[PDB]
Amino acid sequence: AVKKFKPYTPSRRFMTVADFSEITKTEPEKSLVKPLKKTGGRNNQGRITVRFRGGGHKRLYRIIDFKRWDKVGIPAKVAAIEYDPNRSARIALLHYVDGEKRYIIAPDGLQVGQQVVAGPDAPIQVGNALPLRFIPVGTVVHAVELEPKKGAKLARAAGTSAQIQGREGDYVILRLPSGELRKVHGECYATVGAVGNADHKNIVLGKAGRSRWLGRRPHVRGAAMNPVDHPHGGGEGRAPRGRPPASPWGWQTKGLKTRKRRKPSSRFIIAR
Amino acid sequence: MKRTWQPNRRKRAKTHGFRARMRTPGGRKVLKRRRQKGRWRLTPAVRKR
RNA sequence: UGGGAGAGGGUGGUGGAAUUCCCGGAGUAGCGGUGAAAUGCGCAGAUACCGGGAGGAACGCCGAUGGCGAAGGCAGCCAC
RNA sequence: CGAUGUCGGCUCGUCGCAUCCUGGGGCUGAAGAAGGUCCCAAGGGUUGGGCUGUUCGCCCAUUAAAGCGGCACGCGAGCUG
RNA sequence: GAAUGCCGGCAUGAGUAACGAUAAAGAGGGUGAGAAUCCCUCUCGCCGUAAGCCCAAGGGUUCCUACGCAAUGGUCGUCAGCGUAGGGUUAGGCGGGACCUAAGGUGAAGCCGAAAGGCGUAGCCGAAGGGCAGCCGGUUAAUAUUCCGGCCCUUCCCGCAGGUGCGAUGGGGGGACGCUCUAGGCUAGGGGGACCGGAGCCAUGGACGAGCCCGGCCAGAAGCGCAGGGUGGGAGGUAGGCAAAUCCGCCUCCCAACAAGCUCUGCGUGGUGGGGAAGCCCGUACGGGUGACAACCCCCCGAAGCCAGGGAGCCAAGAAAAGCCUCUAAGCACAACCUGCGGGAACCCGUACCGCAAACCGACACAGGUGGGCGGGUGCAAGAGCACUCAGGCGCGCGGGAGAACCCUCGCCAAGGAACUCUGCAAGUUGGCCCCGUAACUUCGGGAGAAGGGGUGCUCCCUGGGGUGAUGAGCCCCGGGGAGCCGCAGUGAACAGGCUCUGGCGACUGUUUACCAAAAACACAGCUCUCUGCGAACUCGUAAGAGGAGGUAUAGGGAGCGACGCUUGCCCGGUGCCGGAAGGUCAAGGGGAGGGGUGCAAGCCCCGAACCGAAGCCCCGGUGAACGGCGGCCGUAACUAUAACGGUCCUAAGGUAGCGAAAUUCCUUGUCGGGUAAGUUCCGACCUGCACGAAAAGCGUAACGACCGGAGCGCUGUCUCGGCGAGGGACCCGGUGAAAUUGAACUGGCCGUGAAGAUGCGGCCUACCCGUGGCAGGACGAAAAGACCCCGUGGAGCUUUACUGCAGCC
RNA sequence: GAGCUAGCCCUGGCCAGGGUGAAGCUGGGGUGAGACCCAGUGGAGGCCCGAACCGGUGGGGGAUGCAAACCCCUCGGAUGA
RNA sequence: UGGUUCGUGGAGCCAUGGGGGAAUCUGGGCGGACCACCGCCUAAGGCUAAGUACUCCGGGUGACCGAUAGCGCACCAGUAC
Ligand SMILES: [Mg+2]
Ligand SMILES: [Mg+2]
Ligand SMILES: [Mg+2]
Ligand SMILES: [Mg+2]
Ligand SMILES: [Mg+2]
Ligand SMILES: [Mg+2]
Ligand SMILES: [Mg+2]
Ligand SMILES: [Mg+2]
Ligand SMILES: [Mg+2]
Ligand SMILES: [Mg+2]
Ligand SMILES: [Mg+2]
Ligand SMILES: [Mg+2]
Ligand SMILES: [Mg+2]
Ligand SMILES: [Mg+2]
Ligand SMILES: [Mg+2]
Ligand SMILES: [Mg+2]
Ligand SMILES: [Mg+2]
Ligand SMILES: [Mg+2]
Ligand SMILES: [Mg+2]
Ligand SMILES: [Mg+2]
Ligand SMILES: [Mg+2]
Ligand SMILES: [Mg+2]
Ligand SMILES: [Mg+2]
Ligand SMILES: [Mg+2]
Ligand SMILES: [Mg+2]
Ligand SMILES: [Mg+2]
Ligand SMILES: [Mg+2]
Ligand SMILES: [Mg+2]
Ligand SMILES: [Mg+2]
Ligand SMILES: [Mg+2]
Ligand SMILES: [Mg+2]
Ligand SMILES: [Mg+2]
Ligand SMILES: [Mg+2]
Ligand SMILES: [Mg+2]
Ligand SMILES: [Mg+2]
Ligand SMILES: [Mg+2]
Ligand SMILES: [Mg+2]
Ligand SMILES: [Mg+2]
Ligand SMILES: [Mg+2]
Ligand SMILES: [Mg+2]
Ligand SMILES: [Mg+2]
Ligand SMILES: [Mg+2]
Ligand SMILES: [Mg+2]
Ligand SMILES: [Mg+2]
Ligand SMILES: [Mg+2]
Ligand SMILES: [Mg+2]
Ligand SMILES: [Mg+2]
Ligand SMILES: [Mg+2]
Ligand SMILES: [Mg+2]
Ligand SMILES: [Mg+2]
Ligand SMILES: [Mg+2]
Ligand SMILES: [Mg+2]
Ligand SMILES: [Mg+2]
Ligand SMILES: [Mg+2]
Ligand SMILES: [Mg+2]
Ligand SMILES: [Mg+2]
Ligand SMILES: [Mg+2]
Ligand SMILES: [Mg+2]
Ligand SMILES: [Mg+2]
Ligand SMILES: [Mg+2]
Ligand SMILES: [Mg+2]
Ligand SMILES: [Mg+2]
Ligand SMILES: [Mg+2]
Ligand SMILES: [Mg+2]
Ligand SMILES: [Mg+2]
Ligand SMILES: [Mg+2]
Ligand SMILES: [Mg+2]
Ligand SMILES: [Mg+2]
Ligand SMILES: [Mg+2]
Ligand SMILES: [Mg+2]
Ligand SMILES: [Mg+2]
Ligand SMILES: [Mg+2]
Ligand SMILES: [Mg+2]
Ligand SMILES: [Mg+2]
Ligand SMILES: [Mg+2]
Ligand SMILES: [Mg+2]
Ligand SMILES: [Mg+2]
Ligand SMILES: [Mg+2]
Ligand SMILES: [Mg+2]
Ligand SMILES: [Mg+2]
Ligand SMILES: [Mg+2]
Ligand SMILES: [Mg+2]
Ligand SMILES: [Mg+2]
Ligand SMILES: [Mg+2]
Ligand SMILES: [Mg+2]
Ligand SMILES: [Mg+2]
Ligand SMILES: [Mg+2]
Ligand SMILES: [Mg+2]
Ligand SMILES: [Mg+2]
Ligand SMILES: [Mg+2]
Ligand SMILES: [Mg+2]
Ligand SMILES: [Mg+2]
Ligand SMILES: [Mg+2]
Ligand SMILES: [Mg+2]
Ligand SMILES: [Mg+2]
Ligand SMILES: [Mg+2]
Ligand SMILES: [Mg+2]
Ligand SMILES: [Mg+2]
Ligand SMILES: [Mg+2]
Ligand SMILES: [Mg+2]
Ligand SMILES: [Mg+2]
Ligand SMILES: [Mg+2]
Ligand SMILES: [Mg+2]
Ligand SMILES: [Mg+2]
Ligand SMILES: [Mg+2]
Ligand SMILES: [Mg+2]
Ligand SMILES: [Mg+2]
Ligand SMILES: [Mg+2]
Ligand SMILES: [Mg+2]
Ligand SMILES: [Mg+2]
Ligand SMILES: [Mg+2]
Ligand SMILES: [Mg+2]
Ligand SMILES: [Mg+2]
Ligand SMILES: [Mg+2]
Ligand SMILES: [Mg+2]
Ligand SMILES: [Mg+2]
Ligand SMILES: [Mg+2]
Ligand SMILES: [Mg+2]
Ligand SMILES: [Mg+2]
Ligand SMILES: [Mg+2]
Ligand SMILES: [Mg+2]
Ligand SMILES: [Mg+2]
Ligand SMILES: [Mg+2]
Ligand SMILES: [Mg+2]
Ligand SMILES: [Mg+2]
Ligand SMILES: [Mg+2]
Ligand SMILES: [Mg+2]
Ligand SMILES: [Mg+2]
Ligand SMILES: [Mg+2]
Ligand SMILES: [Mg+2]
Ligand SMILES: [Mg+2]
Ligand SMILES: [Mg+2]
Ligand SMILES: [Mg+2]
Ligand SMILES: [Mg+2]
Ligand SMILES: [Mg+2]
Ligand SMILES: [Mg+2]
Ligand SMILES: [Mg+2]
Ligand SMILES: [Mg+2]
Ligand SMILES: [Mg+2]
Ligand SMILES: [Mg+2]
Ligand SMILES: [Mg+2]
Ligand SMILES: [Mg+2]
Ligand SMILES: [Mg+2]
Ligand SMILES: [Mg+2]
Ligand SMILES: [Mg+2]
Ligand SMILES: [Mg+2]
Ligand SMILES: [Mg+2]
Ligand SMILES: [Mg+2]
Ligand SMILES: [Mg+2]
Ligand SMILES: [Mg+2]
Ligand SMILES: [Mg+2]
Ligand SMILES: [Mg+2]
Ligand SMILES: [Mg+2]
Ligand SMILES: [Mg+2]
Ligand SMILES: [Mg+2]
Ligand SMILES: [Mg+2]
Ligand SMILES: [Mg+2]
Ligand SMILES: [Mg+2]
Ligand SMILES: [Mg+2]
Ligand SMILES: [Mg+2]
Ligand SMILES: [Mg+2]
Ligand SMILES: [Mg+2]
Ligand SMILES: [Mg+2]
Ligand SMILES: [Mg+2]
Ligand SMILES: [Mg+2]
Ligand SMILES: [Mg+2]
Ligand SMILES: [Mg+2]
Ligand SMILES: [Mg+2]
Ligand SMILES: [Mg+2]
Ligand SMILES: [Mg+2]
Ligand SMILES: [Mg+2]
Ligand SMILES: [Mg+2]
Ligand SMILES: [Mg+2]
Ligand SMILES: [Mg+2]
Ligand SMILES: [Mg+2]
Ligand SMILES: [Mg+2]
Ligand SMILES: [Mg+2]
Ligand SMILES: [Mg+2]
Ligand SMILES: [Mg+2]
Ligand SMILES: [Mg+2]
Ligand SMILES: [Mg+2]
Ligand SMILES: [Mg+2]
Ligand SMILES: [Mg+2]
Ligand SMILES: [Mg+2]
Ligand SMILES: [Mg+2]
Ligand SMILES: [Mg+2]
Ligand SMILES: [Mg+2]
Ligand SMILES: [Mg+2]
Ligand SMILES: [Mg+2]
Ligand SMILES: [Mg+2]
Ligand SMILES: [Mg+2]
Ligand SMILES: [Mg+2]
Ligand SMILES: [Mg+2]
Ligand SMILES: [Mg+2]
Ligand SMILES: [Mg+2]
Ligand SMILES: [Mg+2]
Ligand SMILES: [Mg+2]
Ligand SMILES: [Mg+2]
Ligand SMILES: [Mg+2]
Ligand SMILES: [Mg+2]
Ligand SMILES: [Mg+2]
Ligand SMILES: [Mg+2]
Ligand SMILES: [Mg+2]
Ligand SMILES: [Mg+2]
Ligand SMILES: [Mg+2]
Ligand SMILES: [Mg+2]
Ligand SMILES: [Mg+2]
Ligand SMILES: [Mg+2]
Ligand SMILES: [Mg+2]
Ligand SMILES: [Mg+2]
Ligand SMILES: [Mg+2]
Ligand SMILES: [Mg+2]
Ligand SMILES: [Mg+2]
Ligand SMILES: [Mg+2]
Ligand SMILES: [Mg+2]
Ligand SMILES: [Mg+2]
Ligand SMILES: [Mg+2]
Ligand SMILES: [Mg+2]
Ligand SMILES: [Mg+2]
Ligand SMILES: [Mg+2]
Ligand SMILES: [Mg+2]
Ligand SMILES: [Mg+2]
Ligand SMILES: [Mg+2]
Ligand SMILES: [Mg+2]
Ligand SMILES: [Mg+2]
Ligand SMILES: [Mg+2]
Ligand SMILES: [Mg+2]
Ligand SMILES: [Mg+2]
Ligand SMILES: [Mg+2]
Ligand SMILES: [Mg+2]
Ligand SMILES: [Mg+2]
Ligand SMILES: [Mg+2]
Ligand SMILES: [Mg+2]
Ligand SMILES: [Mg+2]
Ligand SMILES: [Mg+2]
Ligand SMILES: [Mg+2]
Ligand SMILES: [Mg+2]
Ligand SMILES: [Mg+2]
Ligand SMILES: [Mg+2]
Ligand SMILES: [Mg+2]
Ligand SMILES: [Mg+2]
Ligand SMILES: [Mg+2]
Ligand SMILES: [Mg+2]
């Protein structure tokens, strides 16, 4: 839906805030299962290796369930849907009949009080997790494992999904959110449905401060620098570059493909 | 204005102390040189308890 | 009250022909287009044919000089 | 070049005359008034503004006239910048 | 004898500058050999959300006392933060540690590294973060929440008494948290009083009066009373909380749905314990006596503090561990643990003093800097603002005169108001609150404090609301209405915007060249391109490993542009990039046709053609919000003129929209209009664009700007064109007393000359010796081994299709 | 060598007092249901004025200074990047 | 690739990182590409004084200095600062 503001200040005339009506009466999170101390830090053992990070709001990390084959057959009731600061999606807090409480990444259409389960059994319903093989060809799915028993790694951002295209021996063909055509092992678990919070792409940050709240420090152009700091540095009053556009470290940034050619993964990819 | 020397006993001891010098080979060489030179004080005197 | 007709509107599904593209087989001196031709594609192996895959669009005969709506308009079927 | 601060303005002037006006004067195509040119003569005086960093120039209103140049294109151990 | 030589000593300036904030001094009396400066008394001035108090870091004997002035103090000094000597720092409760954990560090296991060494789950260290039991008074010259007095607590150990299955570094709960706005009751604090307690006092015209002026509290167990914070209670089942678990979690039933009850805080009351002003008398460098059997009462304001884990809202979504409670396991149930009461034990370290400053950082008794808490009254609207002033602490460690020029700060001004000038630079106008009333434009919020006008004091009368008192008196806040009074002036003093039009640039809040540039530069939300399928790409690292990220295409990295509105056209010949199992060239390797060297020979050793050989380049294509670029000449219309039209040359293609003499336009003050009396500036247009142009984006854009340009109303010492006054210096006297510079000097002017600019050479002229206040013309004045220029086969920083290499990648 | 300085990480503290009054809610108007419009409440914002506090805009002074970056007036932000 | 005078040179010998990969006296290395003859050695295991280097320390001597010299210090100096 997206919240809008009146221009009672500049930067408030384009600012826009997400709709939190799907956040059930549960704003503060769950102890026990989560939170962990989350270690803010823009750098390695010493050196910054990803520029322009730092600042922004403190965050507690929600240690979510990305491998649902622990509770094969054990159903759970969706107790709540909460805001997760460490990801774009929302998170669903579910109570297993087992008594154990877990968070799943909250798919689109998930309602509070609804029944969800994981396993080869599992009715093909939104929220349920299955090995890819037993899911009907053509249904959309998310939180897809890459290799069996390694954890969900595909389609976890707000409003993303993958669609099952076909099967081929022990593998099923997925069309990933990028549009890549990928061979993924049949035994890989994935949970049916799309991610939801799909209005995430429609939010307008509004001002610089909002960028800072998310820990995103200002990004300065190479043109603004000096030849010591970027081959785009200098020269005189503005400059159109003078060479194929490059990163600070000298590699070209318009077209140069960079995935290594001889990767063993190559014989499982079909598209772009 | 604000000058460069802003004393701190913990900073002085943690930065120039005997144990800090002993922790690395470069500082052990510092203590070796000051000993051979006959320095009365191998490391800065940081006081208080 | 009792019945009748109808592409009335919508949501969710769902079918086949066909187009284009990708993959394999086997096949080679051109295809294409126009009043005439060229651009163009084709010796890096095309058009033609077969097998499978993908996606979008409208709905072939029925179909009518037919029907429905206030109008613009409304067409493969199913349920609500 | 092991130092001679460089345009323009302000302030302080001072010097040369090949004279902008004032005074003397020959000639005049000098009726008179006013002019032209010219010899002698610097004692003094030689406005306030608009434009522009401007020197210079163009204009507005005047005036007897709105002079040219030298003094490290005078003058920053005087000022500005 | 020289090296702007090195070390040391002494001159010069020169008794000159300065004596370190303009908050301020006068007198008198002590002491002393010596008093503007030390002591005491009075008069005066200054600070007072400090220039007063309390903590923290730092400092480290500066604290106190006694004896002293050679040196330190910008002078003096009998003085001190100085010298000599002595003394002073007392804790189970304050702070730190025999408590905990975070970043980070360290680090057994383990991983890596020529070596030194690097990462590294556990554990450990690691703190104004959590946990922890004390308040009030009195005493020293110096310590006190440490010593004493009163009252109150905390742990441990041993004993009896009563209870219970006790019971772990293990399981669970708890601790446990953001920003803004807040309700209820309290406290600190403050205002006050006809009430109480006081030594006193009627002055100078009046006042013996509810007169003046001072003070009217502090802490305090148990039990209480009020406000408040936390919490449901059971009965079954159980597969989860990595063993077990009566605990937790989860499902099903029942009573609560209440904060009733249970604990837990704070605040009043409280057995009881302390303090107790002004004034007067004393001798202190200060404190004591008395006032004192001191009184210790009632209202009002009321916090940002307490009840604090209270409530509500919002997105950007808000530490960890231990102490604490429960649960159980090995073990043990003669243990052990819980409760109550006794007796016993309770360590180590700091404790002085300064602490917005003469004790910390500044070489200095330096106008700079330094975290946190308290920080009173009055009045101006308010408030930590500003003016005065309690408590208190100061007069800034050279004075005295004078009344010059001149410098700085400040005040005023006739008449004119920007004529000054680069430019209203500066300064001046305006200025707080209440009430009316406001345009274009606009993104509908704004522009708005537009502009701009009126009121503002004081007395009396009537009168409406609230809060605390019971539905009332007092009291505390706000108003409304009506008459009057005074001055030039009523936010009367202090703090408290000048106004308007237009354009250029940037959307806007912001960031930046510490120490000359705060901008039109950077950033910014937003838009586009590209890379990247998770052991992701990219980055650091030899590696291990770490970031990316405990993230997964709505995610992450690079690049550019830069809100928003409207839009971003043609050229892929060249470069970059992307896609192309064809062909050409193409290294090592394979292959051996053939030939060579020795040998009596088998043999051994060499070269060595075809032929099979990758990536790359060539070649084929795509791709410009990738690198980039987007023409010329001649002719033609019936007034001339122009050329909608035509022809031709060439390129890969031959700038469309939109703007345009611009932040771009040389000629140029292009040309017309407008602003002026006058307009190389400014604005509106034409287009002949030397040399705009569409994401190094193009054209506009409300608002915004310590950005830049132009113009006007208002106001001025900016100017005609200056004058006067005040003060701190300058100046004279006493006192302490620098500096760079300096070949030596007994150092005139002119006209010449001299290395081309003479005090010193030539000729003439002028000129007694020597000082003081001063102006700057000169001594090519001082200060920097010229920073522009050139040179050196001098150095450094950058980029590239310069050379040759290296990391990295194929 | 990061006790100055730049960035970040962990944990603490601070921002007086005033104005403007977003969304949402309550009532009412209006419809078939709305949208929407009035009030009242409400306390939003890289909100406005402006002390502490963080700055350093313009001018004057200072230039062997109080100061090897200062001083006076003026100026910016001032719940947020 | 390194060492040797040896810098690819006719480039060996000695050591190696790397691919292949023997034998035990009629066995193997070498005599500077290579081959034949003729000669010298017996690798892939370790220990080995002396003669040789130096002067923190002690002693002796000086066509060595004599407080701006001589070690930075003749003196409580690697101190004061
Ligand atoms: Mg590391
Ligand atoms: Mg690092
Ligand atoms: Mg480190
Ligand atoms: Mg998470
Ligand atoms: Mg979410
Ligand atoms: Mg940027
Ligand atoms: Mg730059
Ligand atoms: Mg570069
Ligand atoms: Mg570069
Ligand atoms: Mg530059
Ligand atoms: Mg250029
Ligand atoms: Mg460039
Ligand atoms: Mg170029
Ligand atoms: Mg690709
Ligand atoms: Mg790369
Ligand atoms: Mg590749
Ligand atoms: Mg020169
Ligand atoms: Mg020379
Ligand atoms: Mg000289
Ligand atoms: Mg000179
Ligand atoms: Mg000179
Ligand atoms: Mg000149
Ligand atoms: Mg000049
Ligand atoms: Mg003449
Ligand atoms: Mg005449
Ligand atoms: Mg005449
Ligand atoms: Mg005449
Ligand atoms: Mg004449
Ligand atoms: Mg003359
Ligand atoms: Mg004359
Ligand atoms: Mg003028
Ligand atoms: Mg003018
Ligand atoms: Mg003249
Ligand atoms: Mg002259
Ligand atoms: Mg000249
Ligand atoms: Mg000139
Ligand atoms: Mg001149
Ligand atoms: Mg000057
Ligand atoms: Mg000058
Ligand atoms: Mg001069
Ligand atoms: Mg001067
Ligand atoms: Mg000499
Ligand atoms: Mg000499
Ligand atoms: Mg000589
Ligand atoms: Mg010298
Ligand atoms: Mg002297
Ligand atoms: Mg004197
Ligand atoms: Mg003098
Ligand atoms: Mg003098
Ligand atoms: Mg003097
Ligand atoms: Mg002074
Ligand atoms: Mg006296
Ligand atoms: Mg006396
Ligand atoms: Mg005596
Ligand atoms: Mg402390
Ligand atoms: Mg000190
Ligand atoms: Mg002392
Ligand atoms: Mg004494
Ligand atoms: Mg003394
Ligand atoms: Mg003295
Ligand atoms: Mg002094
Ligand atoms: Mg004394
Ligand atoms: Mg003292
Ligand atoms: Mg002393
Ligand atoms: Mg102990
Ligand atoms: Mg002990
Ligand atoms: Mg401890
Ligand atoms: Mg400990
Ligand atoms: Mg610990
Ligand atoms: Mg850790
Ligand atoms: Mg770390
Ligand atoms: Mg450790
Ligand atoms: Mg380590
Ligand atoms: Mg670690
Ligand atoms: Mg604490
Ligand atoms: Mg404690
Ligand atoms: Mg004391
Ligand atoms: Mg107590
Ligand atoms: Mg128990
Ligand atoms: Mg038990
Ligand atoms: Mg226990
Ligand atoms: Mg626990
Ligand atoms: Mg816990
Ligand atoms: Mg109240
Ligand atoms: Mg009280
Ligand atoms: Mg009170
Ligand atoms: Mg009172
Ligand atoms: Mg009172
Ligand atoms: Mg009495
Ligand atoms: Mg009387
Ligand atoms: Mg009185
Ligand atoms: Mg009273
Ligand atoms: Mg009580
Ligand atoms: Mg109660
Ligand atoms: Mg049970
Ligand atoms: Mg249970
Ligand atoms: Mg268990
Ligand atoms: Mg009480
Ligand atoms: Mg008393
Ligand atoms: Mg005293
Ligand atoms: Mg506070
Ligand atoms: Mg709460
Ligand atoms: Mg709360
Ligand atoms: Mg935790
Ligand atoms: Mg622990
Ligand atoms: Mg047991
Ligand atoms: Mg047992
Ligand atoms: Mg003490
Ligand atoms: Mg003390
Ligand atoms: Mg003090
Ligand atoms: Mg201060
Ligand atoms: Mg302070
Ligand atoms: Mg000071
Ligand atoms: Mg100091
Ligand atoms: Mg002083
Ligand atoms: Mg401060
Ligand atoms: Mg106060
Ligand atoms: Mg006050
Ligand atoms: Mg007062
Ligand atoms: Mg008041
Ligand atoms: Mg006010
Ligand atoms: Mg305060
Ligand atoms: Mg004040
Ligand atoms: Mg006082
Ligand atoms: Mg002084
Ligand atoms: Mg005045
Ligand atoms: Mg005047
Ligand atoms: Mg007047
Ligand atoms: Mg006027
Ligand atoms: Mg003018
Ligand atoms: Mg003038
Ligand atoms: Mg101007
Ligand atoms: Mg001004
Ligand atoms: Mg005024
Ligand atoms: Mg005012
Ligand atoms: Mg003003
Ligand atoms: Mg007024
Ligand atoms: Mg208007
Ligand atoms: Mg108008
Ligand atoms: Mg309207
Ligand atoms: Mg405007
Ligand atoms: Mg408005
Ligand atoms: Mg007004
Ligand atoms: Mg009442
Ligand atoms: Mg009342
Ligand atoms: Mg009046
Ligand atoms: Mg004032
Ligand atoms: Mg104002
Ligand atoms: Mg005005
Ligand atoms: Mg403007
Ligand atoms: Mg324009
Ligand atoms: Mg212009
Ligand atoms: Mg800006
Ligand atoms: Mg603002
Ligand atoms: Mg600067
Ligand atoms: Mg610096
Ligand atoms: Mg600097
Ligand atoms: Mg600099
Ligand atoms: Mg500046
Ligand atoms: Mg600025
Ligand atoms: Mg868009
Ligand atoms: Mg790397
Ligand atoms: Mg790594
Ligand atoms: Mg990683
Ligand atoms: Mg992570
Ligand atoms: Mg992205
Ligand atoms: Mg990016
Ligand atoms: Mg840009
Ligand atoms: Mg658009
Ligand atoms: Mg374009
Ligand atoms: Mg383009
Ligand atoms: Mg285009
Ligand atoms: Mg191309
Ligand atoms: Mg091209
Ligand atoms: Mg090419
Ligand atoms: Mg290619
Ligand atoms: Mg090839
Ligand atoms: Mg070959
Ligand atoms: Mg032969
Ligand atoms: Mg091509
Ligand atoms: Mg004609
Ligand atoms: Mg033509
Ligand atoms: Mg041609
Ligand atoms: Mg055009
Ligand atoms: Mg033009
Ligand atoms: Mg023009
Ligand atoms: Mg004209
Ligand atoms: Mg004109
Ligand atoms: Mg002008
Ligand atoms: Mg044209
Ligand atoms: Mg341009
Ligand atoms: Mg163009
Ligand atoms: Mg472009
Ligand atoms: Mg732009
Ligand atoms: Mg424009
Ligand atoms: Mg624009
Ligand atoms: Mg504009
Ligand atoms: Mg500005
Ligand atoms: Mg700004
Ligand atoms: Mg005006
Ligand atoms: Mg004046
Ligand atoms: Mg004047
Ligand atoms: Mg005159
Ligand atoms: Mg005066
Ligand atoms: Mg004197
Ligand atoms: Mg001469
Ligand atoms: Mg002579
Ligand atoms: Mg002479
Ligand atoms: Mg003199
Ligand atoms: Mg002078
Ligand atoms: Mg002179
Ligand atoms: Mg001279
Ligand atoms: Mg000179
Ligand atoms: Mg030099
Ligand atoms: Mg030199
Ligand atoms: Mg030079
Ligand atoms: Mg030059
Ligand atoms: Mg050369
Ligand atoms: Mg060179
Ligand atoms: Mg360098
Ligand atoms: Mg630092
Ligand atoms: Mg404070
Ligand atoms: Mg509203
Ligand atoms: Mg507000
Ligand atoms: Mg604001
Ligand atoms: Mg503002
Ligand atoms: Mg402000
Ligand atoms: Mg700043
Ligand atoms: Mg300041
Ligand atoms: Mg300033
Ligand atoms: Mg100045
Ligand atoms: Mg302002
Ligand atoms: Mg070699
Ligand atoms: Mg070799
Ligand atoms: Mg050779
Ligand atoms: Mg060789
Ligand atoms: Mg080998
Ligand atoms: Mg050998
Ligand atoms: Mg051989
Ligand atoms: Mg040989
Ligand atoms: Mg051996
Ligand atoms: Mg000597
Ligand atoms: Mg010596």
Swiss-Prot record, chain A:
GO CC aspect terms: large ribosomal subunit
Domain of life according to the entry: Bacteria
MF (Gene Ontology): rRNA binding; structural constituent of ribosome; transferase activity
One matching Pfam family: Ribosomal_L2
Region of interest: Disordered: 222-272
GO biological process: cytoplasmic translation
InterPro entries: NA-bd_OB-fold, Rib_uL2_dom2, Ribosomal_uL2, Ribosomal_uL2_bac/org-type, Ribosomal_uL2_C, Ribosomal_uL2_CS, Ribosomal_uL2_dom3, Ribosomal_uL2_RNA-bd_dom
Presence of keyword Transferase: no
Biased composition (Basic residues): 256-272
Keyword Ribonucleoprotein included in the entry's annotation: yes
Keywords, ordered alphabetically: Ribonucleoprotein, Ribosomal protein, RNA-binding, rRNA-binding
Segments of skewed composition (Basic and acidic residues): 229-239
HAMAP family for this protein: Ribosomal_uL2_B
PANTHER family per UniProt: LARGE RIBOSOMAL SUBUNIT PROTEIN UL2M (PTHR13691:SF5), RIBOSOMAL PROTEIN L2 (PTHR13691)
Function per UniProt: One of the primary rRNA binding proteins. Required for association of the 30S and 50S subunits to form the 70S ribosome, for tRNA binding and peptide bond formation. It has been suggested to have peptidyltransferase activity; this is somewhat controversial. Makes several contacts with the 16S rRNA (forming bridge B7b) in the 70S ribosome.
Subunit note: Part of the 50S ribosomal subunit. Forms a bridge to the 30S subunit in the 70S ribosome, contacting the 16S rRNA. May also make transient contacts with protein S6 during translation in the 70S ribosome.
Family in the record: Belongs to the universal ribosomal protein uL2 family.
Protein name: Large ribosomal subunit protein uL2
Organism, as annotated: Thermus thermophilus (strain ATCC 27634 / DSM 579 / HB8)
UniProtKB/Swiss-Prot annotation, chain B:
Gene3D superfamilies: 1.10.287.3980
Assigned keywords, A-Z: Ribonucleoprotein, Ribosomal protein
GO molecular function, a single term: structural constituent of ribosome
Biased composition (Basic residues): 29-49
Example of a GO cellular component annotation carried by this entry: ribosome
Residue ranges of the region described as Disordered: 26-49
GO biological process: translation
The family this protein is said to belong to: Belongs to the bacterial ribosomal protein bL34 family.
SUBUNIT field: Part of the 50S ribosomal subunit.
Other comments on record: The open reading frame (ORF) for this protein is entirely within the ORF for the RNase P protein (RnaP). The two start codons are separated by four nucleotides.
Function: Found on the solvent side of the large subunit.
Protein name as annotated: Large ribosomal subunit protein bL34
Species name: Thermus thermophilus (strain ATCC 27634 / DSM 579 / HB8)
